[PDB]
Amino acid sequence: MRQRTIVCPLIQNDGCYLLCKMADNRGVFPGQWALSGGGVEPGERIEEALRREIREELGEQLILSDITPWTFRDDIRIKTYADGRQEEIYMIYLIFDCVSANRDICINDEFQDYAWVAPAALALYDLNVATRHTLALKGLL
């Protein structure tokens, strides 16, 4: 029963949403599509954590017009060990609406590809579970 808080940006430009394709040895299923995001370090505000993770994962050339808190949600993930023993990980997600003023992306090693996706197409991507739950809540699927 361990605990993680994740800050997640939902980045939009010109009506399209940014999705990133996870690198081939990341995730339980490799090469799923996802929102970027990460944890909040001791000593940092949640918006400071968000902006740092954007720069790290998507590069310094991406210019944000604004960032607004949207909503939160939670999930339990199970980690199953080699002998079938399990541990639960309790995740809280803090989701921000982000509008970017441009589309210049430089992905880091966590990702292998990215796309700017029309809302109608989002559901059809092989989204990871977290990303599907988030976009579903937003009414985009």
UniProtKB/Swiss-Prot annotation:
Catalytically driven reaction(s): a ribonucleoside 5'-triphosphate + H2O = a ribonucleoside 5'-phosphate + diphosphate + H(+); a 2'-deoxyribonucleoside 5'-triphosphate + H2O = a 2'-deoxyribonucleoside 5'-phosphate + diphosphate + H(+); dUTP + H2O = dUMP + diphosphate + H(+); dTTP + H2O = dTMP + diphosphate + H(+)
Covalent S-S links between cysteines: none
Residue ranges annotated for the Nudix hydrolase domain, each copy included: 1-141
UniProt-listed Pfam families: NUDIX (PF00293)
Gene Ontology molecular function terms on file: dCTP diphosphatase activity; dTTP diphosphatase activity; dUTP diphosphatase activity; hydrolase activity, acting on acid anhydrides, in phosphorus-containing anhydrides; magnesium ion binding
Protein's recorded name: Nucleoside triphosphatase NudI
Entry-linked SUPFAM superfamilies: Nudix
Record keywords: Hydrolase, Magnesium
InterPro entries reported for this sequence: Nucleoside_triphosphatase_NudI (IPR023781), Nudix_hydrolase (IPR020476), NUDIX_hydrolase-like_dom_sf (IPR015797), NUDIX_hydrolase_CS (IPR020084), NUDIX_hydrolase_dom (IPR000086)
Cofactor section: Mg(2+)
Similarity annotation: Belongs to the Nudix hydrolase family. NudI subfamily.
GO CC annotations, alphabetized: cytoplasm
PANTHER family xref list: GDP-MANNOSE MANNOSYL HYDROLASE, MUTT_NUDIX FAMILY PROTEIN
Function statement: Catalyzes the hydrolysis of nucleoside triphosphates, with a preference for pyrimidine deoxynucleoside triphosphates (dUTP, dTTP and dCTP).
EC number annotated for this UniProt entry: 3.6.1.9, 3.6.1.12, 3.6.1.-, 3.6.1.23
Motif extent (Nudix box): 38-59
Enzyme class: hydrolase
Protein source organism: Salmonella typhimurium (strain LT2 / SGSC1412 / ATCC 700720)
Segments crossing the lipid bilayer: none
Highest taxon above the source species: Bacteria
Keyword Magnesium carried by entry: yes
